Design a protein around this ligand. Structure first.
Ligand SMILES: [Cl-]
Ligand SMILES: [Cl-]
Ligand SMILES: [Cl-]
Length: 129
């Protein structure tokens, strides 16, 4: 599913991501924009052989099981395929664990490089929330 911008903001809020660990909704929408362009089915293969999955490009090295990332963990206790669903529940619940791991949203390098320090409120501007 490719979400609309406000549609995704609303879904993220519904699932308790708004201001989670102090990160406003615009941060999360911005991260999703640059990670996946709002496409739940996004996948990308990393140089280390791991894969990133879903709207927030969650990585199989630590967070989910895909059966093909040697030496990896599955800390969200989910198959990576669950992160591709039109229902963002699994991605949100896993993101909550990731952002709580110590480095906040810096875990998403694209958030650090493209969202951090910017006017992230622009991502939810106009949205009925
Ligand atoms: Cl915001
Ligand atoms: Cl594996
Ligand atoms: Cl980047």
């Amino acid at each position: 599913k490719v979400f609309g911008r406000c549609e995704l903001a609303a879904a993220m809020k519904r699932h308790g991501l708004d201001n989670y660990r102090g990160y406003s909704l615009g941060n999360w929408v911005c991260a999703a924009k640059f990670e996946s362009n709002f496409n739940t089915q996004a996948t990308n293969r990393n140089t280390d052989g791991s894969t990133d999955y879903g709207i927030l490009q969650i990585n199989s090295r630590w967070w989910c099981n895909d059966g093909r990332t040697p030496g990896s963990r599955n800390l969200c206790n989910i198959p990576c395929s669950a992160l591709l669903s039109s229902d963002i529940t699994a991605s949100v619940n896993c993101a909550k664990k990731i952002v709580s791991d110590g480095n906040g949203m810096n875990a998403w390098v694209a958030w650090r490089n493209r969202c951090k320090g910017t006017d992230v409120q622009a991502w939810i501007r106009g949205c009925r929330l």
